[PDB]
Amino acid sequence: AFDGTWKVGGLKLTITQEGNKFTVKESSNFRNIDVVFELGVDFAYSLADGTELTGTWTMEGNKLVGKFKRVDNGKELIAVREISGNELIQTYTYEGVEAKRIFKKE
Template identity: 80%
Template sequence: MVKRKLAAHDGLKLIITQEGNKFTVKESSNFRNLEIVFELGVNFTYTLADGTELSGTWSLEGNNKLIGKFTRVDNGKELIAVREVSGDELIQVSCKKDL
């Protein structure tokens, strides 16, 4: 419950740029600023704001949908995230299994 309350006041902003298969995501929020660089289909490690470490990949579906498939490093549970551009908005959906 505490994590949900903090997330509601996070003020997260994302800037995503692409050069071929290489993406740069700049995250800016009330709690942290971070730059993540990854290539499509190449495994990398990422740490969530709460300290949870994930390992996985992003893939591109069509021209506007990024699909991330990640596994928690500590317990092997899966997280799938979908980021899709709709008009001038970025919509993210996350599916977790007992994350």
């Protein structure tokens, strides 16, 4: 069950779901921000009053895949990741470059 903390010491991360409604609590570097998404639903949101991404997020039991558009940069920033063992990685793919930070279940 995802309702748990998955992060590396110093940072914190927490997922929680009311039935099917997944919210992610991200604290890294120097900002804590939550992102809520429904399985296979499209939604637009502004993160930290800067990234305004409109996209649909699909979750497979151990697969997180979507596509989001951020006009205030390059109209395409996507997060895609699968869950391996007990850990969570997070990839931000913009234009055609993948950058990912590594985390694990707390």
